[PDB]
């Protein structure tokens, strides 16, 4: 017995919200390598991504998927900044014998990836307006690869 149901019409593939968000990051992480532009940090050996986390990340392309995730997240909420992105990648720290609490994300790694997008000029200030935003060239970089992944 196969699975039932559709929507009434076959779903339009145009904008980025129609794409499933995990499957977007699978493609665009590979796009960052094969293009070449974006550029590596020095510190990649260290990190782990948060004060709360007790271990480093397993996957060696943890930076590209993070820079993939943050760039689409500008399209979801236009106006946001570094203390904003500390909240969105928050997590349960384990205090020890004590009960559990929230904690904020790492500020170095989350700021650096934005500065590399500023060098190309996909996400930019906003010097007077509080919080970063994606530009015109930022959208067409996103929306051209939205149609590709479903195809």
């Amino acid at each position: 017995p196969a699975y039932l149901y559709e929507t009434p019409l076959e779903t339009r593939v145009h904008t980025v919200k129609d794409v499933k968000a995990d499957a977007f990051i699978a493609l665009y992480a590979n796009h960052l390598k094969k293009r070449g532009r974006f550029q590596l940090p020095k510190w990649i050996d260290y990190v782990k991504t948060a004060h709360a986390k007790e271990l480093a990340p397993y996957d060696p392309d943890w930076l590209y998927i993070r820079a993939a995730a943050i760039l689409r997240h500008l399209y979801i909420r236009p106006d946001c900044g570094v203390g904003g992105f500390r909240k969105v990648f928050s997590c349960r720290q384990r205090r020890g014998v004590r009960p559990n609490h929230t904690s904020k994300a790492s500020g170095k790694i989350i700021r650096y990836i934005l500065q590399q997008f500023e060098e190309m000029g996909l996400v930019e200030s906003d010097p007077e307006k509080p919080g970063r935003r994606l530009t015109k060239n930022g959208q067409r970089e996103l929306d051209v690869i939205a149609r590709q992944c479903a195809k």
Binding site: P1, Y3, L4, Y5
Partner: protein
């Protein structure tokens, strides 16, 4: 229409035996075991729920595993797939035949005629025999996989098939006959 997970149809199939009939709620039916609704204001709204909902509802234990119905939906959705894999027919017809045979027939109550705590033979109601059936199904499956590196879904699928069967390997079908050991003597 109405199918569980969309891969099964409530339509068709049948109750196994007389008694425990109408107490069970099939027939109409909801895709997905889950339903948040009011079932505990009267004392026989408990047998309006379909028993797949009562399985996923009572599958959460103990203190650590309570809640998270969404989690118990998954492992039952895998369990009904495995039941289908062996002795394939209908997961529901095998599950309905399991909870038919699962619960105990008779029980020992304490009636002393003043002073003593003395046992006496009493037959079990149709509702309690369904209540005890789904409880005893799970507590076998949970205990079976508690320390073993075997997925709970595996234990549940295995436990249900065994209950339909007369193997007696199960925790449930043993604990039927363990009560019926003493309930024979208390006559």
């Amino acid at each position: 229409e109405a199918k569980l997970f969309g891969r099964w149809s409530y339509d068709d199939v049948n109750v196994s035996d007389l008694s425990l009939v109408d107490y069970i709620a099939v027939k109409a039916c909801v895709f997905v075991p889950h339903t948040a609704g009011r079932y505990q204001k009267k004392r026989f709204r408990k047998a309006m729920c379909p028993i797949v909902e009562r399985l996923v509802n009572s599958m959460m234990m103990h203190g650590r595993n309570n809640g998270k119905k969404t989690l118990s939906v998954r492992i039952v959705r895998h369990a009904f797939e495995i039941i289908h894999l062996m002795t394939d027919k209908n997961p529901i017809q095998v599950f309905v035949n399991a909870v038919e045979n699962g619960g105990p027939r008779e029980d020992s109550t304490r009636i002393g005629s003043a002073g003593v705590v003395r046992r006496q033979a009493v037959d079990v109601s149709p509702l309690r025999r369904v209540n005890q059936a789904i409880y005893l199904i799970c507590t076998g499956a949970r205990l079976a996989a508690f320390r073993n590196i075997k997925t709970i879904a595996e234990c549940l699928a295995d436990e249900i098939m065994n209950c339909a069967k007369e193997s007696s390997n199960a925790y449930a079908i043993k604990k039927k006959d363990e009560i019926e050991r003493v309930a024979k003597a208390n006559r």
